[PDB]
Design a protein around this nucleic acid. Structure first.
Ligand SMILES: O=P(O)(O)O[C@H]1[C@H](OP(=O)(O)O)[C@@H](OP(=O)(O)O)[C@H](OP(=O)(O)O)[C@@H](OP(=O)(O)O)[C@H]1OP(=O)(O)O
Ligand SMILES: O=P(O)(O)O[C@H]1[C@H](OP(=O)(O)O)[C@@H](OP(=O)(O)O)[C@H](OP(=O)(O)O)[C@@H](OP(=O)(O)O)[C@H]1OP(=O)(O)O
Ligand SMILES: [Mg+2]
Ligand SMILES: [Zn+2]
Ligand SMILES: [Zn+2]
Lengths: 442, 384
RNA sequence: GCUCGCGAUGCGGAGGGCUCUGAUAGCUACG
């Protein structure tokens, strides 16, 4: 009992009413108090719970961190307890992504603030709390309906929020690249550097953390949250929808589940193939779950299930980031999922709104985040790049797939990841129709 | 005592009611507080002496999707008639073990060896189902009110919507038809917030009228069992009930032998039950003959107030299935198909029941009545 | 006999907010 333990420890300590959003199948409250001179916070869909979590927050931070059920504890990464406590890092990133979402959604009064899933990327450069900035923000829980896949890179295949956040992260990564390889006055203030091995690398101590308001679909969610206490298969998403099915073993096309995709990023990096031709691989340092966190299942699904992996290409590893949930977890909303996806990256004017079921925008235009637009920015970068900084002999490219193919080493990493999955008995990844990349900027 | 069917109905009504009172110390315990009551009653002879209450249950709710057990430990559906059947299953297992103890005890079982394999019921034993009301979906949705003679019967028997399969839906009112033919559920979807679909009680009883009431696991031992009559405490509409129970799928064909489309007696009672004023309780009570006390389960969690699993969850039933499996002569089995000892797979071992269920789903689909909606599979992937 | 669209009056499981009662338990204050 949070309220009871705190008001038995401390004197009579009443509070006041702060926030009131929605009603019925959607409502939200937030409470704050001052205990021993503090300003703690608590969020919940009814008043008694908002304050109760504010109480457990105040207690854990002030006297000693709360002792809870064990599966709700976070596993520290292979390296890094530097970002203060891991749980405090989670609270920080979560509040940051919520705050920027509030900014983009005219402070939650916009109709797009109704979201079933919220995702975000956060960049940090220094252990001090000030040195932290929200890179991108996104929403979405649906996928392109197979009937509307546009082949020439004009449709978004996957608008689950965490996917959209990674794609905005790439949109930010290219911009930092042009910052470095633009007017060289931008080279001092940049996240990039020429690599100590030939090519491009990130500056030391600049990290990225991933936030999802919930556990990613697929393997990291397949568990009973009210019975914490051997299968890790790959799963594919269901037609234009939330929820995943496992793959058969060794008729419409499937998109891989979000747990599977997060694994892939934990092996071959978040930058993808084209970016690999230029930058050294980049790995998320932490994963923050708004809700539905179970340390065991999350760890299984993110990297542990493919610990049978070997033959790590030069500069690749099985990335084992920090896993953690947030202190004040979100709660389940029964009901249908929106048909839209919201994306925003740092430096952007406004949010962008895509219809998740068509992958083209609310008006019918392709996205600032689809294959075609990303290729054009990649071509911009290939133009003004010194011809010797490239990592493979990517000679002036003509087609999206082939340019992707020039990332021989990235592709080696993909090969060994698929090997790890089949050798583990978890099934065979579902590769997209290859023709979905057979276009140029023509 | 040869009787008009109306006396049979009033009798079973009386019986289930009195048993409920006895368990609730004359309806005075707070566990008497119920909106709906169901019961099973067994007969062995036409005389009133030859009638015994097999089980008693109450309830009007189903589980929150956040609380589904990946280890067979939570009850999905506590509508009363669902729960009463599960109590029947517990008595069924007990009677198997009563036969398999020794031949002085096997004389007093309701089972006997079948001349076709496994066990069969002794002749002159039949089961009757009592619901104090109409079962949700097709038998109820169109007129959930006591009809008055002024208003005869259904003025629109041919609307598309008559006879459709329907689901209960998490945090939603009503029983919904199955749209776009169907949309299978997922585990990580329902966790996200996809509302959990559960087939309606009208549908489930239809299903029991084709594949029998024993489920698949029990089919591995027993021949199929059918309710001989269905008795309604209130809200009885003969045309809708008969449509809902069997007639909507009287197109069913090529069923395994000893499977059939069962058309039980349908009847309401002389003095209908009356509405229970109050909030609907969120809890369900269960009892089988031979039980010490009632069990009280929170329907929205499907576990008991302390958090314990039910003597009725998938897991407890699997355990009773294994106990009987041990004592069964490996040649007395009705299916010799072997399966690893996990709940889902074991059920697959019931090839003939599965065939029947396939014919049931096909009958509904070819009738335009929709496609059955199953739960996410991850809830049957458990062992002991 | 029905289907579909738009209305209209109703019928029939979630969330929230405020009051009433009893009880359990932790705390004070007073005589
Ligand atoms: O964010 P996503 O939608 O998951 O995008 C990825 C990405 O495609 P794009 O880069 O064109 O957006 C992958 O390419 P890389 O990032 O590795 O360069 C691609 O995999 P391949 O290019 O290796 O084919 C994969 O598609 P799939 O894994 O199904 O082939 C595809 O995800 P979707 O196809 O699910 O959109
Ligand atoms: O109607 P209920 O009392 O809820 O239980 C039934 C029963 O499941 P269990 O008896 O295994 O608990 C059916 O299984 P059988 O008796 O036929 O073996 C099962 O159907 P399947 O096992 O054929 O999948 C059905 O589940 P479903 O409705 O998904 O087909 C399930 O009912 P609920 O899922 O509604 O709880
Ligand atoms: Mg099923
Ligand atoms: Zn997803
Ligand atoms: Zn029902």
């Amino acid at each position: 009992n949070p309220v009871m333990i705190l008001n038995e420890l401390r004197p009579g300590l009443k509070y006041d009413f702060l926030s009131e959003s929605g009603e019925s199948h959607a409502k939200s409250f937030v409470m704050s108090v001052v205990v021993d001179g503090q300003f703690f916070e608590g969020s919940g869909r009814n008043k008694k719970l908002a304050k109760a979590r504010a109480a457990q927050s105040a207690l854990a931070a002030i006297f000693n961190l709360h002792l809870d059920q064990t599966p709700s504890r976070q596993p520290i990464p292979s390296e890094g307890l530097q970002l203060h406590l891991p749980q405090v890092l989670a609270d920080a990133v979560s509040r940051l992504v919520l705050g920027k979402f509030g900014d983009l959604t005219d402070n939650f009064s916009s109709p797009h603030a109704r979201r079933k899933v919220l995702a975000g990327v956060v960049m940090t450069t220094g252990t001090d709390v000030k040195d932290a900035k929200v890179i991108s923000v996104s929403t979405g829980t649906k996928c392109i309906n197979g009937e509307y896949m546009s082949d020439r890179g004009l449709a978004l295949n996957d608008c689950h929020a965490e996917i959209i956040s990674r794609r905005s992260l790439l949109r930010f990564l290219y911009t930092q690249l042009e910052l470095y390889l633009n007017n060289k006055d931008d080279q001092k203030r940049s996240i990039f550097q020429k690599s100590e091995r030939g090519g491009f690398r990130l500056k030391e101590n600049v990290q990225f953390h991933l936030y999802i308001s919930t556990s990613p679909c697929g393997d990291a969610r397949i568990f009973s949250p009210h019975e914490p206490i051997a299968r890790g298969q790959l799963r594919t998403k269901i037609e234009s929808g939330q929820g995943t099915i496992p793959v058969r073993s060794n008729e419409r096309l499937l998109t891989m589940s979000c747990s599977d995709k997060i694994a892939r990023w934990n092996v071959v990096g978040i930058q993808g193939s084209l970016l690999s031709i230029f930058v050294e691989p980049i790995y998320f340092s932490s994963i923050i779950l708004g809700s539905l966190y179970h340390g065991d299942h999350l760890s299984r699904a993110m990297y542990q299930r493919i610990s049978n992996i070997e033959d790590l290409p030069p500069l690749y590893t099985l990335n084992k980031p920090l896993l953690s949930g947030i202190s004040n977890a979100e709660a389940r909303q029964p009901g249908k999922a929106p048909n839209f996806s919201v994306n925003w990256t740092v430096g952007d004017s406004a949010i962008e709104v895509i219809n998740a079921t068509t992958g083209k925008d609310e008006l019918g235009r392709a996205s600032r985040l689809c294959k075609h637009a990303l290729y054009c920015r990649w071509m911009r970068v290939h133009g003004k790049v010194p011809s010797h900084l490239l990592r493979s002999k990517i000679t002036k490219p003509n087609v999206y797939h082939e340019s992707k193919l020039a990332a021989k080493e990235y592709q080696a990493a993909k090969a060994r990841l698929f090997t790890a999955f089949i050798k583990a008995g978890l099934g065979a990844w579902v590769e997209k129709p290859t023709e979905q990349d057979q276009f140029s900027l023509t």
